[PDB]
Design a protein around this ligand. Sequence first.
Ligand SMILES: CCCCCCCC/C=C\CCCCCCCC(=O)O[C@@H](COC(=O)CCCCCCCCCCCCCCC)COP(=O)([O-])OCC[N+](C)(C)C
Ligand SMILES: CCCCCCCC/C=C\CCCCCCCC(=O)O[C@@H](COC(=O)CCCCCCCCCCCCCCC)COP(=O)([O-])OCC[N+](C)(C)C
Lengths: 368, 368
Amino acid sequence: ALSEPLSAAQLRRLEEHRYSAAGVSLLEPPLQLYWTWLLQWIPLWMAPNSITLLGLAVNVVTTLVLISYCPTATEEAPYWTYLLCALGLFIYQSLDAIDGKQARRTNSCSPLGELFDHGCDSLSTVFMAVGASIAARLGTYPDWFFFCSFIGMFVFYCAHWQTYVSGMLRFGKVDVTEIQIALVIVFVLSAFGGATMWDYTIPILEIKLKILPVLGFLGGVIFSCSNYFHVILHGGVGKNGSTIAGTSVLSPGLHIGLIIILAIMIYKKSATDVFEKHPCLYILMFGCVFAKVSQKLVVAHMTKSELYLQDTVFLGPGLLFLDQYFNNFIDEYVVLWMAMVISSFDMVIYFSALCLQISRHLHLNIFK
Amino acid sequence: ALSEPLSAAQLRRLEEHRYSAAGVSLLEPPLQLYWTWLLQWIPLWMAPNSITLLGLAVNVVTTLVLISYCPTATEEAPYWTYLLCALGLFIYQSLDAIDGKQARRTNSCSPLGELFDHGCDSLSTVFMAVGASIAARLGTYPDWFFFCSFIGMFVFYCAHWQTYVSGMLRFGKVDVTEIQIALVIVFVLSAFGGATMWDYTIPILEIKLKILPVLGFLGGVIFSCSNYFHVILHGGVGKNGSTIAGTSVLSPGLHIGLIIILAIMIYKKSATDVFEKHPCLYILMFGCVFAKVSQKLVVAHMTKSELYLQDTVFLGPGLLFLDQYFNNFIDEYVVLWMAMVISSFDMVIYFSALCLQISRHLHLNIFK
Ligand SMILES: CCCCCCCC/C=C\CCCCCCCC(=O)O[C@@H](COC(=O)CCCCCCCCCCCCCCC)COP(=O)([O-])OCC[N+](C)(C)C
Ligand SMILES: CCCCCCCC/C=C\CCCCCCCC(=O)O[C@@H](COC(=O)CCCCCCCCCCCCCCC)COP(=O)([O-])OCC[N+](C)(C)C
């Protein structure tokens, strides 16, 4: 059951699926020419998934180095790692636009071209949220460093939730490019100037200035989530009011609801403060868990199937829950690292098995 | 979804099902004549389910009165309620044998004749375990008063688990009649003599004498559970090694495993001692939960279907878990009573809806 996570009929609907998108906003038309200009120099024999993997690897490595120099969020790393992580984010966005575009150039358009960008994009969402939240030094306001970061997951889920009830990705007037440019702006601003300026309050209203960008982000989240939820509650494609697989429209929200609710409990209950001594492992552990859950919803909307709550990676956070349901029976930092290891292996094994099965069933190499 | 817990195809397999049993042991042949002798005086127009309900009502009322005079298990009720509860147990056993036998007399043999005795028998198992454990005053050894009582559930489940992989009830050389006569013996012994004799240790080995009957019961549990598990792990009927519905043989054990594991956690974690101030509400709450779970397995083995972990009555104990996962946020006795109310209503609603649907689909009255 490990090496065959899909059935033959699921492979048939995946072969039947066709990709579609209906998203135009403000910041793309200045960037389309730039993306094409970086595109033509790339040789045509390079596989698209190689581009995706290169971007994800660069972003993960740079954000891991930045996490290494700042495991918490109350101290400043040297500016060179801020600039390097910003360049990693920019090259990641460039390679994602390139992979979406240059892959179409060969009849490579295939469904492993997605069920990938939507896995690599999930991982990059988690890592980018952690990196942006560190660079702004949100450890002085730990609640935000939690809440904002998990909003950075939830919006993503809503976007794919939208697709699950429409079969086509609707972007909206403010979307991924705006966040990505805003985050490279905050990265280069915390790089060129000292990060201590984020502690400089405004004399107008005595606000710490770490609150203004996060409330701008929160307001944009309100716009995008209203735009998503309108068609979540008013888009019925597969039936009179249901989703593209016939499942009730409110079913996929249970997954991200359970993840966020578990995060709330393990935040609030912890007698030993796991955050104020070691964050960014907690958010990475829910990052791997949310990565598998979002990958499952990706598979669900491009292959018409019902969502399933039963997953093995909920053994990751759930372990913490058990070790918090008792007294600390094992030291919480050690069980958190164990949850890291078990969730990371289960996510990686699931994702590699999925790509291997998709490649073997279609008799196509992962790299062409 | 409340008023139709079954599908049309499930009703079809229930109509297809036929009852079978292969159990003969020591204590039945002296009792068969007695049961028939009490049987012939009963008029033929009385419905079998009326007999089942009368027995269950008498047992529940008597055990509830005995619980009322001893909410804990460290004090003695007057002897008249001991004798009354013993007579209730005996008349319950008599009416169960009568309902199994005299119902066959009309083409009443129907499948609502079971999917009842196996619901009323589950309720009676829980109530009888609580009554026997009170009458022996197991509050001085609370662990036993827990553990033994939950063994009194688990064996029952194993029996039906046996049926789930063989389609026919195998009793064994020691079975329900032995327990029932032993419990009416312990009831009349604690009635005629003072219950304080259960505190009289034996000078031979300094044993409290509440340990000897519970270890005899435990040994008999070992015999019966080995007899069940041999065909659990070596009976394959519907497939090469699977169950009568094709489901893996170890799947139904997860339900009773989860119930017992939740009971273990809420026992051990409780900072405020729920037991030493108010037991017999805790065991009754897991009694209603285990009653619904065992009723579901009854439906599963006489109507070929897969077991489902998702049930609403796990909101009952689970609530305690949540109120224990935090600090006591609400006083534990009050949330335990709330769990009582919610689990009792969900179990009663499920069971009455099930019987109503079975009656309406077959166009047969519940009483004939
Ligand atoms: C920050 C300033 C605020 C002002 C503006 C507010 C804006 C927010 C408003 C509204 C939000 C709208 C978001 C919708 C996202 C869609 C999800 C999705 O699947 O798309 C993509 C995933 O997307 C990603 O790769 C990144 C996900 C971003 C969320 C994490 C940010 C949280 C960090 C917060 C930390 C802050 C720390 C404190 C602050 C210093 C999928 O990729 P694709 O579709 O295949 O790409 C091809 C399409 N293309 C060709 C167009 C490229
Ligand atoms: C106690 C002395 C120990 C010595 C002997 C050890 C013996 C134990 C050994 C082995 C155990 C074997 C048990 C198997 C039961 C089968 C389950 C089942 O579905 O059958 C029946 C349910 O059964 C019931 O109604 C009652 C269930 C009894 C369990 C609760 C007792 C715990 C109390 C412990 C508290 C102790 C306190 C401390 C002690 C003072 C279903 O009913 P039926 O099949 O439809 O009926 C018709 C068939 N008939 C015609 C045959 C009637």
